[PDB]
Structure formats: structure tokens, C-alpha cells
Amino acid sequence: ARLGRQALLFPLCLVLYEFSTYIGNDMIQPGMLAVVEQYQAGIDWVPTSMTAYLAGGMFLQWLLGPLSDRIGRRPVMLAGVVWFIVTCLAILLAQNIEQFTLLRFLQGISLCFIGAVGYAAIQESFEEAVCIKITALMANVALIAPLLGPLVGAAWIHVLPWEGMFVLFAALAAISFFGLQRAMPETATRIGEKLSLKELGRDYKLVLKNGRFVAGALALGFVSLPLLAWTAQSPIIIITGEQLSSYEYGLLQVPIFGALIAGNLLLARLTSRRTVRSLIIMGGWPIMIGLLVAAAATVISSHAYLWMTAGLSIYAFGIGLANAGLVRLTLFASDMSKGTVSAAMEMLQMLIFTVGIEISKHAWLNGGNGLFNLFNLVNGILWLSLMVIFLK
């Protein structure tokens, strides 16, 4: 009725779509420089790829979850994977940057599907301990894809063009898609229910008014932004800005990332020894020194990219520790539905990220490299403020 040990070929179809989606950001960003030095506009449009790719996610975010309830889980999930493979290749026929966004944004809306419909079909079919192994894997995906995507994204620009990636994914999404064609047993018990959408944001306005949740979502939104600012701009920061090569550049991704995960290995090993509340304040020191250090560094010295990247590691480590923990408490900051609390915190996080990245954009151009790190501190500051309230 629920689980066994034989239909494990289906979750890997979901986990593979999860994989191919993140790298859709975590490889293209370095290679966007080649996409920028071809479409003709400027290096300012490098990060602005990630941005439109994000802003898509939070679009149907809130709708697809209840929508996948009203009209099945199988067809909603399929329409998404199709939509992805479709847009993964139809992008190679745009050939201009004012409408490079358009399709980048369309692949962006193909992100809610993984959580809104996909993740639910595991909290509906498979049992507790069965799901636990599945999710801790899904956890690793969203950390390895950004960790090891940029390395393959740095070789792939040296050994191939940028067009090679867009196919490779539509392939990797169809790899699991033809694995999902006849192996996706839906679990939606709301078929034959009204198209109630004009009063759907009512179940949303309840969490949207929670003086504790909102703060805790923004505590989360901001705290992590600096990470994705780098992820968005490190191509330019380094290859152009600092004047470096794809080895000396792709070198700098890992120390950040390797420390990030060092924050997860220890988190998993001290979730036992220590309480949740403690862990966030326990991770709220390395960060606070990271975004201290990153900027304290680019004060008089404007080009010391080593110690900035070294800042974003102290920075990086603590994020492993904090974020995750704080996620728990932001969910249970509201005594409501998992899905809607989730729908909110995500439809917030991105606003923070999408916009966050744009404000981080000009910050670099105009201000140089200094301002950038200060508009990193801000959010350290920002986050920390939210904490002085949150726990006490």
C-alpha cells in the first residue's frame, strides 16, 4: 500500500531532475562569459542570467502545489519535465540577449515542479524512514550540483562550446523522463474539486502575517544571499574582473564550497550533541567573521581576491551549520501546513535572491570590489539583526 524495496527506480527519476535543474545554473554561469562575448551587450548581463532563471521559480511556485492536488501528481510533474526539455533546446534558436532572458526565465519556472509536485509524491507514497533516506540524498544533490557543476562548467568551455550543455541536460531530464513515462504512480486525492484560486491566497495570508515566520524567512533569505551573489558574479569577478583563467578561477569555487559542506558534515555530527537554537548561534560566528573578513579585507586593498574568497569560506562553513537548522524553525514557526509554509518561504527567499543579486550587480560595477563585500556585510548585518529578535 505504501513502500517496499523494488520500485526504487522511480525516486532516482525525481532525484535526476533535481540534479539537472541546479547545474542548469551551476555550470552556465562561468560559461555565460562566452554567451556574453557572442550576444553583444555587456558583462553586466553575465549574472543577470541566474537572476531570470531564479525569478521564474517563484512564479507558479504557490500555484503548482495546490494545483498538483486538484488535477493529479503524474500529469503535473510530466508537464514540467517536458517543459524543461522543450526550453532546454529552444533556447539555442533565440540568438539575442534581450530574449535570452525570456527562455532562461522559462527554464526558471521549471523549478517549482521539483518541490510543489515532485517532493509531495514522496510525502504521499513512501513511508517515514523510507522517505528519510530519499531526502538526505536530495539534500546532497542540491549541494553537490553547485559544488561540482562549476568544475565541469570550466572544462566544458575549454573542450567544447556553451551550446553543448543545453542539450546534455534536455538529455539528462529525458534520461529520467523516459524513466518516468511508464513509472510514475500518482497520489493526488483532490481530483474533482473546484477551481478555487480566487480564495487560495487566504491560506497564504495566514503565514504571510506571522511576525515570527516572515522574519525567520528573511533571516534565511538574506543570510544565504552573499553565497549566491558570488555564484552569480564569480565568472566576472574573477575571469574578467580579477583577470584569471578557468583553472585559477574554478580553483576558488571549491575552497568556498568544500567549507560549505564541512558545515554540513559537522551539522550532521552535532545535531545529536547540541540543540537547534544553539547550532544557529554556533554557526552565526564563522559567517559573522566571514562577511567581516571578506569586506574588512577589500578596504584599502581592492584586489586581494584570495582573502575575499578566503572570507567567503569562514562565510561558507557557517552557512552549512546555520541555514539548515534555521530551516526547521522557520517551518515550525507556523503551526500550519508544510506545503504552504514551504510555498511562502520559497516565494520569499527568491525575491531576496533575485532582487538581492541585482542590487549586488551594480554594487560591483560602480563601487568596484569593495562595495560588493559591504553589500555582502549588510546581509550578515541584516540576518543577525533578525536573529537578535528571532531567538530572544
Ligand X SMILES: C[C@H](CCC(=O)O)[C@H]1CC[C@H]2[C@@H]3CC[C@@H]4C[C@H](O)CC[C@]4(C)[C@H]3C[C@H](O)[C@]12C
Residues that bind ligand X (CB under 6 A): 115, 119, 138, 142-143, 224, 227, 319, 323, 346
SS (H, E, C) the chain: CCCCCCCCCCHHHHHHHHHHHHHHHHCHHHHHHHHHHHHCCCHHHCCHHHHHHHHHHHHHHHHHHHHHHHCCCHHHHHHHHHHHHHHHHHHHHCCCHHHHHHHHHHCCHHHHHHHHHHHCCCCCCCCHHHHHHHHHHHHHHHHHHHHHHHHHHHHHHHHCCCHHHHHHHHHHHHHHHCCCCCCCCCCCCCCCCCCCCCCCCHHHHCCCCCCCHHHHHHHHHHHHHHHHHHHHHHHHHHHHHHHCCHHHHHHHHHHHHHHHHHHHHHHHHHCCCCCHHHHHHHHCCHHHHHHHHHHHHCCCCCCCHHHHHHHHHHHHHHHHHHHHHHHHHHHCCCCCCHHHHHHHHHHHHHHHHHHHHHHHHHHHHCCCCHHHHHHHHHHHHHHHHHHHHHCC
Residue number with the shortest CB distance to ligand X? 142
**Cα–Cα distance measured from residue 83 to residue 169, given in angstroms and rounded to the nearest whole number:** 13
Least distance in angstroms from the C-beta of 143 to ligand X: 6
Cβ closer to ligand X: 143 or 168?
143
Least distance in angstroms from the C-beta of 320 to ligand X: 8
Least distance in angstroms from the C-beta of 158 to ligand X: 26
User: C-alpha cell of 20?
Assistant: 539537472
Cβ closer to ligand X: 78 or 341?
341
Angle at 122 between CA 23 and CA 339, to 5 degrees: 85
Least distance in angstroms from the C-beta of 294 to ligand X: 16
**Cα–Cα distance measured from residue 207 to residue 53, given in angstroms and rounded to the nearest whole number:** 26
Cβ closer to ligand X: 23 or 36?
23
Least distance in angstroms from the C-beta of 151 to ligand X: 17
User: C-alpha cell of 100?
Assistant: 535570452
Least distance in angstroms from the C-beta of 323 to ligand X: 4
Cβ closer to ligand X: 35 or 322?
322
Cβ closer to ligand X: 26 or 69?
26
Least distance in angstroms from the C-beta of 192 to ligand X: 29
Cβ closer to ligand X: 173 or 319?
319
Least distance in angstroms from the C-beta of 91 to ligand X: 22
Cβ closer to ligand X: 36 or 350?
350
Cβ closer to ligand X: 46 or 138?
138
Cβ closer to ligand X: 66 or 115?
115
Least distance in angstroms from the C-beta of 319 to ligand X: 5
